[PDB]
Design a protein around this ligand. Structure first.
Ligand code: VBY
Ligand code: CL
Ligand code: CL
Ligand code: CL
Ligand code: ZN
Ligand code: ZN
Ligand code: ZN
Ligand code: ZN
Length: 312
């Protein structure tokens, strides 16, 4: 018998005395060591005193798991640990003062999301995500990346979309203050305002231009005609404008950052463009700069606080 610490959150630790003859599994159920599944493994001497994640198997641990992760999904832990087993081997170089990810395991979308998250104002509701976000920002992003995979229901190597990933993370964030008022104007039906809150207040799919959204865009009306959707009022610290990739000109100082996407649906490559004193293009570990940019953009992020249109 050695003694170990079991946990679900790596905050509340529980002392166990484990049989050196019995597997971890026989004694605790599914058991992980820094991401690596050790259910079917017996305890080695150098395991003495270390901390293992266990699957919750009593009320105390289920409550601590919900309080840390904001999920009761029993697969969540195993998916988090399977992802961490890879993300702990990725490299996280600082590029232009941001934690990036050196390319591995089709991670371009995760690196682009990670870089974006360091440039917009967001508070995560699950303490697991908030703690890992602070650690990632200071250069240790392995846990954060594994949690992004677990929360998005994605595995390492799976092809991912930055807009879809940001959408899932925003659903785990405090965006309640965020408010969007839209006006739709049709010839026949007339004018209808609607108010959106939370995630739907900060995301739009259909144009990259925040300015064009303010001037209005042409959308189908239930009557059958085209109509004009325009932005009446925005209350959020940022907005995310997305569209199917298309050649687009990015101007220094007119946006926060953007997702570049090159190639076919699903199996292309993301890079990240950020507006500093000049335009930086972050491609995992690679960095280029230029004063101008035109290329295939699918997401553009902008700063906001309070906007009210000058349209009656
Ligand atoms: C829901 C299923 C799904 O697999 N989604 C998903 C997963 C992973 C990726 C990389 C993408 C994706 O290719 N995203 C880019 C940005 C994209 C977005 C929209 C329209 C597009 C049209 C042409 C080309 C790219 C287009 C989508
Ligand atoms: Cl715990
Ligand atoms: Cl929740
Ligand atoms: Cl949540
Ligand atoms: Zn406990
Ligand atoms: Zn929650
Ligand atoms: Zn891997
Ligand atoms: Zn109508």
């Amino acid at each position: 018998t050695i003694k170990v610490f079991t946990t679900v959150d790596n905050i509340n630790l529980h002392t166990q005395v484990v049989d050196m003859s019995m597997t971890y599994g026989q004694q605790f159920g599914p058991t992980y060591l820094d991401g690596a599944d050790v259910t079917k493994i017996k305890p080695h001497n150098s395991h003495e005193g270390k901390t293992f994640y266990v699957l919750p198997n009593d009320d105390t641990l289920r409550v601590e798991a919900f309080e840390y992760y904001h999920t009761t999904d029993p697969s969540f832990l195993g998916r988090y640990m399977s992802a961490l087993n890879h993300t702990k081997k990725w490299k996280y170089p600082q590029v232009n003062g941001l934690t990036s990810i050196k390319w591995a395991d089709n991670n371009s979308y995760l690196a682009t999301a990670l870089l974006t998250l360091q440039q917009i104002e967001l508070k995560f509701n699950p303490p697991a995500l908030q703690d890992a976000y602070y650690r990632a920002r200071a250069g240790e992003a392995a846990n954060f990346c594994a949690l992004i995979l677990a929360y998005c229901n994605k595995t390492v190597g799976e092809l991912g979309d930055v807009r879809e990933t940001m959408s899932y993370l925003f659903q785990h964030a405090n965006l309640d203050s965020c408010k969007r008022v839209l006006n739709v104007v049709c010839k026949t039906c007339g004018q209808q305002q609607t108010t959106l809150k939370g995630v739907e207040a900060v995301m739009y799919m259909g144009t990259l231009s925040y300015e064009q959204f303010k001037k209005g865009v042409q959308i189908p009306c239930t009557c059958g005609k085209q109509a004009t959707k325009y932005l009446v009022q925005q209350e959020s610290p940022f907005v995310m404008m997305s569209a199917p990739p298309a050649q687009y000109e990015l101007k220094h100082g007119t946006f926060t950052c953007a997702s570049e996407y090159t190639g076919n649906y699903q199996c292309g490559h993301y890079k990240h463009i950020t507006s500093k004193e000049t335009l930086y293009c972050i491609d995992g570990a690679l960095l280029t700069k230029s004063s101008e940019y035109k290329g295939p953009i699918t997401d553009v992020f902008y700063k906001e606080n309070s906007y009210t249109t000058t349209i009656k």
